[PDB]
Design a protein around this nucleic acid. Structure first.
Lengths: 202, 217, 172, 158, 129
RNA sequence: ACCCGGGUAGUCCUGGCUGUAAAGGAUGCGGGCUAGGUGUCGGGCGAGCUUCGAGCUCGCCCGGUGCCGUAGGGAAGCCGUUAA
RNA sequence: GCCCGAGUGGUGGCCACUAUUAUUGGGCCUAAAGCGGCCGUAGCCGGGCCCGUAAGUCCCUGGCGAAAUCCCACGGCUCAACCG
């Protein structure tokens, strides 16, 4: 898809999207940019621009609002909540409240069209039910996370707040570009800070 | 029986309230083609979706119960018996769903099972071609297939017209509910276990479509 | 030999078919039914084995087995070894002497017919017969009659009256 | 690739140059090569090590590729260069090195006999010889009248 | 050692298939396999192959369409008359349609169906369907 | 008898005999093919560090030695590139 | 009341069922069952590439494997068995 300008190249690189952690596995090896002299893996920044574009498309497509962004992360649940406010659909739970998809007796029952997971390793349940219902699945995947069952990717960092902020932000921008309200080439009406998290009292 | 057909489907369509998107589009009369539910792999979550396709009249949804079992769990100062049952939904016309169900009472289980079975419906592709010439109808399966369930190994084999369903009775019930007229049956490994043997035949008739052949091309 | 009994004789589904058949054609014993099943089996078995083998093997073998079925009448004007397998134990039973006597209107009903051929009240060709099995060819159908008989030597045998009240032939 | 023989251990993966015709940035004549070989067999080195030193010094990985074609019956290589001159040992080096070693063992055992392991490799080296003998007989480097034994190993070495 | 190098080709090729890789690599290579892949390609089962002959060995890189279900060598490699074909027809193959019981023959190498049209037979080599 | 206090054969060495085991991984051997991850031992390689020694670490590779697990197999436990 | 019917049943033998003898078509971690491990003789089984023979192997022809029984047709005996 399209060449990495700035906003695109300064945004990901300024936000700690690049910095991935320990472990590589054979399937992920393709998005993996480089080795540091420590086991800390760096992701390709081009591939993130690329795999964010088609993800405006793929989610501008399912235009009815039953896209579900769930998170098991404490960090991530704030960016997600804010992301969902903009778009128009979200399932909130710390878990999935299993029987979101598979059961309609549950008082909280949705019937999605797409999902976004944050960590394939924590949100495995949301995946577990994503194989049965017949739902296509777009996400954020780390140097540690596989792509088994994970059919479309967005290889980005998800372990930190700045990043966890930037992405559910730029994405909230991109799908609003495609569907035709506020563009991904105009500066977003919403500030990044709300998606950014902070600990004053717990 | 004629028009009374849709009338059961429309009587179900009086108070049937869709849980799913699948149950909705069907209840709207859209994609009125069971086959057009299968190809796509859209989840059969509602029982009634099917009751929508199979009226009183033409295909005749032959509901049938194979085995009813009584099992126990031992509990404090108690034996808690229940029942398991195996039921077969199918049209002679080339669909089938095998169901089993477990329950305390008998009647319920029958009911459970009848429902269970609906979800797990399957097309059996029959042998248009036949064995020898595609003279008229699909008498058989296209290709010999085998089932695998615990110890049980069932081969279905193409066949001559009129040489009809040459298998053990248990399967013979299921097959008839499929719509295979003619088929050589080569079993191997304990069938005593009905549930499986059945699961075998079902799996088998299931795998029909899973075979990838040349005439598809 | 000349019979068959399936692996398990007391099976209900097999037994039901027969007893319904047993009244329908009015057999005297089950063995008779069996005769025709076992006869049917052989044609099928052979028809099938012939079609299967390499097409170069003297085709005469096929011709021959299609010739007889035509002559007998089971097969009308169809050209495939696959229609043969599309016969059933009912079709053979339609082909019997007994059946064909009731059909033409020589007898009131098949139960009556059982009486007639035994005492020699049905002639075929120039011969009488005693065996109600008797396989009746298509060419052979046209030559069933009376001549030196209790049904037809006059016009005041009550026999004539018994056949007239019904007047219905057809599958037995 | 491997064969764990008298072992469980996968064999070295050492692998040949996939060169099929020879380097020309390396340069030697059929005459020059032949000299180098004869000089080294004159030292007391043996054909594997002769091919080794030529590789490490003169930069020829295998002789066959460089030499043939110069009489294209077959590939021309070290010992086939030697036999045409008469410098070849009538025993193949393979079989020789083997037997050579073997006679040394026996002397150890002679003085030291309480040795399982050392005893057990006597048994493991003979039986490679046996084989190596067996087939050669039929190929013809060693006459059919021969048979192998530890007095007929102490006579070939001396 | 190896023996039946063909078979160790084929068997890869199928276990290759069953995974649903894209293309194959078969390290040992030959006429048998070469020829057999040739006949295989001729019927169409496979896409294109290149062999590279390394000074070590032939290697075949093979392209996988998706067609193949199962294709295997024969164990003692039995001799089979042209009358006995039908027996060996019913056994090994999945139905009358397929017809690559690949045999080796007087004419060359063929499938089952290409053998029957000529009319000639022999010892079995492998199968494909 | 378990527990305690004495005690011979034996336990050790040399030469010989004997040849058994839940002698197990209850898993004969050889070749090829079939997601991966991680720890570890030894060998190779490209670097950074250095006490200038591969001493401390990162990654690919080769050989071995564990654990976890996809597809598949299994009756299940489990096995799963050290195959069952 | 069900079966069968001038038969029907009892004991014994053989074959099937019994892929419980595995060629077709079985297993062997824990169900029976891996030899405690290795060596190599007899045997079986064998990388690629070219040429000869054509022993196996396939194809064709030709000599020949009695009659009977079997299978199919037609014909004969009222019918079939049985026979031609």
């Amino acid at each position: 898809m399209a060449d990495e300008y700035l906003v695109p190249l300064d945004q990901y690189l300024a936000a700690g999207v690049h910095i991935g952690t320990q472990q590589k596995t054979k399937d992920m090896k393709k998005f993996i940019y480089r080795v540091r002299q420590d086991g800390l893996y760096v992701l390709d920044v081009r591939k993130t621009d690329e795999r964010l574009k088609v993800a405006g498309k793929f989610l501008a497509k399912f235009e009815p609002q039953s896209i579900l962004a769930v998170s098991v992360r404490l960090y991530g649940q704030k960016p997600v909540k804010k992301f969902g406010e903009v778009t128009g659909a979200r399932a909130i739970p710390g878990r999935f409240l299993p029987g979101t998809m598979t059961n309609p007796a549950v008082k909280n029952f949705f019937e999605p069209d797409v999902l976004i997971v944050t960590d394939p390793r924590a949100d495995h349940q949301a995946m577990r039910e994503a194989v049965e219902i017949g739902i296509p699945i777009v996400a954020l995947v780390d140097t540690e996370n596989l792509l088994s069952y994970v059919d479309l990717a967005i290889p980005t960092n998800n372990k930190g707040r700045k990043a966890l902020a930037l992405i559910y932000w730029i994405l909230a921008r991109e799908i609003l570009y495609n569907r035709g309200e506020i563009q991904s080439r105009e500066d977003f009406k919403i500030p990044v800070e709300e998606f950014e998290m902070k600990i004053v009292r717990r | 029986m004629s028009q009374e057909w849709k009338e059961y489907a429309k009587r179900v369509l009086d108070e049937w309230e869709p849980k799913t998107k699948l149950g909705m589009m069907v209840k709207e009369g859209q994609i009125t083609d069971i086959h057009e539910i299968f190809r796509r792999g859209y989840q059969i979550k509602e029982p009634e979706i099917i009751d929508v396709l199979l009226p009183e009249v033409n295909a005749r949804e032959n509901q049938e119960v194979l085995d009813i079992a009584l099992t126990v769990r031992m509990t404090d100062s108690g034996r808690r018996v229940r029942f398991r049952v195996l039921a077969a939904v199918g049209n002679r016309d080339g669909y089938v769903g095998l169901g089993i169900g477990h329950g305390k009472e008998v009647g319920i289980a029958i009911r459970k099972a009848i429902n269970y079975a609906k979800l797990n419906i399957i097309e059996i592709k029959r042998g248009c071609g036949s064995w020898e010439c595609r003279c008229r109808r699909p008498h058989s399966v296209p290709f010999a297939v085998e089932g695998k369930e615990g110890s049980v190994r069932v081969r279905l084999i193409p066949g001559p017209r009129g040489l009809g369903l040459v298998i053990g009775d248990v399967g013979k019930k299921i097959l008839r509910l499929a719509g295979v007229q003619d088929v050589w049956s080569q079993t191997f490994g304990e069938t005593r276990t009905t549930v499986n043997f059945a699961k075998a035949v079902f799996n088998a008739l299931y795998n029909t479509n899973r075979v990838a052949i040349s005439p598809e091309m | 030999k000349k019979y068959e009994t399936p692996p398990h004789p007391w099976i209900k589904e097999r037994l039901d078919r027969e007893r319904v058949l047993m009244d329908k054609y009015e057999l005297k014993n089950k063995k008779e039914l069996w005769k025709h099943e076992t006869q049917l089996k052989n044609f099928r078995r052979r028809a099938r084995r012939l079609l299967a083998a390499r097409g170069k093997q003297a085709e005469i073998e096929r011709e021959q087995l299609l010739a007889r079925l035509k002559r007998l009448g089971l097969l009308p004007e169809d050209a495939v070894l696959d229609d043969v397998l599309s016969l059933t134990i009912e079709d053979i039973l339609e082909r019997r002497l007994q059946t064909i006597v009731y059909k033409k209107g020589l007898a009131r009903t098949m139960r009556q017919a059982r009486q007639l051929i035994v005492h020699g009240h049905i002639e075929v060709n120039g011969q009488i017969i005693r065996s109600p099995s008797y396989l009746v060819l298509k060419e052979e159908e046209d030559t069933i009659t009376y001549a030196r008989t209790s049904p037809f030597a006059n016009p005041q045998h009550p026999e004539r009256m018994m056949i007239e009240k019904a007047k219905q032939g057809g599958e037995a | 690739m491997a064969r764990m023989h008298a072992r469980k251990r996968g064999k070295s993966g050492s692998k040949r140059p996939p060169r099929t015709a020879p380097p020309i940035w390396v340069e030697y004549t059929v005459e020059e090569i032949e000299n180098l070989v004869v000089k080294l067999r004159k030292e007391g080195y043996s054909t594997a090590m002769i091919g080794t030193i030529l590789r490490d010094q003169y930069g020829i990985p295998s002789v066959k590729l460089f030499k043939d074609p110069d009489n294209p019956n077959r590939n021309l290589t070290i010992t086939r260069i030697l036999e045409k001159h008469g410098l070849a040992p009538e025993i193949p080096e393979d079989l020789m090195f083997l037997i050579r070693r073997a006679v040394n063992l026996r002397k150890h055992l002679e003085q030291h006999p309480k040795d399982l392991h050392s005893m057990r490799g006597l048994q493991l080296i003979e039986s490679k010889i046996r084989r190596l003998v067996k087939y050669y007989k039929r190929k013809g480097k060693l006459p059919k009248n021969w048979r192998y034994d530890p007095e007929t190993a102490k006579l070939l070495v001396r | 050692t190896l023996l039946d190098p063909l078979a160790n080709a084929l068997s890869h090729i199928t276990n290759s298939e069953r995974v649903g890789k894209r293309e194959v690599y078969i390290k040992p290579a030959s006429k048998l396999i070469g020829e057999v892949l040739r006949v295989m390609q001729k019927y169409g089962y496979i896409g294109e192959f290149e062999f590279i002959d390394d000074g070590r060995a032939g290697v075949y890189r093979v392209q996988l369409l998706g067609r193949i279900n199962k294709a295997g060598a024969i164990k003692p490699r039995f001799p089979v008359k042209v009358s006995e074909f039908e027996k060996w027809e019913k056994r090994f193959l999945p139905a009358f349609e397929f017809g690559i019981l690949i045999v080796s023959t007087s004419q060359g190498v063929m499938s089952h169906k290409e053998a029957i049209e000529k009319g000639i037979g022999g010892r079995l080599i492998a199968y494909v369907y």
